[PDB]
Amino acid sequence: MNIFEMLRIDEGLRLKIYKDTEGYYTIGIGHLLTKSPSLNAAKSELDKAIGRNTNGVITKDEAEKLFNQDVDAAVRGILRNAKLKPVYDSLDAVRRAAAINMVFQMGETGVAGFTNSLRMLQQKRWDEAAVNLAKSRWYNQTPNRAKRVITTFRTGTWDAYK
Ligand SMILES: Cc1ccc(C)cc1
Ligand SMILES: [Cl-]
Ligand SMILES: [Cl-]
């Protein structure tokens, strides 16, 4: 198991524009296109991202290309963030995958507001962090996914994904 396989499980794969859990236009493997309610705005963002007139549809290859870019970007986002970096550096390989998953899902902004969880993770207080992470809109909105990520931080294994 690795970050790509993990995220592919959590996000699925769709080759036609769709609405995410929050109702935002997305495509491929959780690639958010726009928060605007306009489908046209979404198709325009899509064409700009793929570099071609897609008509709201992409191939598997194109989806996988967006995915690679997105994972890379998340990691780099983390490494660039002064709040995040130190936490990420302190973690083991499995747990780093859980950190990347959250950043990918919610943005470095979103995750950067889990200050108290961050501190617990840095201190390696696993059970406590797990409890703290669950007290969130994130967990209440997407409970099955949050549970998987949380188990990951808690155990440092891929058990929730098998
Ligand atoms: C790097 C990192 C991001 C988010 C959390 C919750 C923990 C670590
Ligand atoms: Cl893009
Ligand atoms: Cl869920």
From Swiss-Prot:
Upon changing T26H, the result is: Facilitates transglycosylation more effectively than hydrolysis; covalently bound substrate
Q: Which CDD domains match?
A: T4-like_lys (cd00735)
The induction field says:
Expressed late in the viral replication.
Q: Please give the annotated consequence of changing D20 to A/N/S/T.
A: Complete loss of enzymatic activity
Q: Which SUPFAM superfamilies match?
A: Lysozyme-like
Changing N132 to M/F does what?
2-fold decrease in enzymatic activity
**Residues that bind substrate:** L32, F104, S117, N132
* Outcome when changing S117I: 500-fold decrease in enzymatic activity
What biological-process GO terms show up in the record? cell wall macromolecule catabolic process; defense response to bacterium; peptidoglycan catabolic process; viral release from host cell by cytolysis
Q: Where in the cell is it found?
A: Host cytoplasm
UniProt name for this protein: Endolysin
Q: State the species of origin.
A: Enterobacteria phage T4 (Bacteriophage T4)
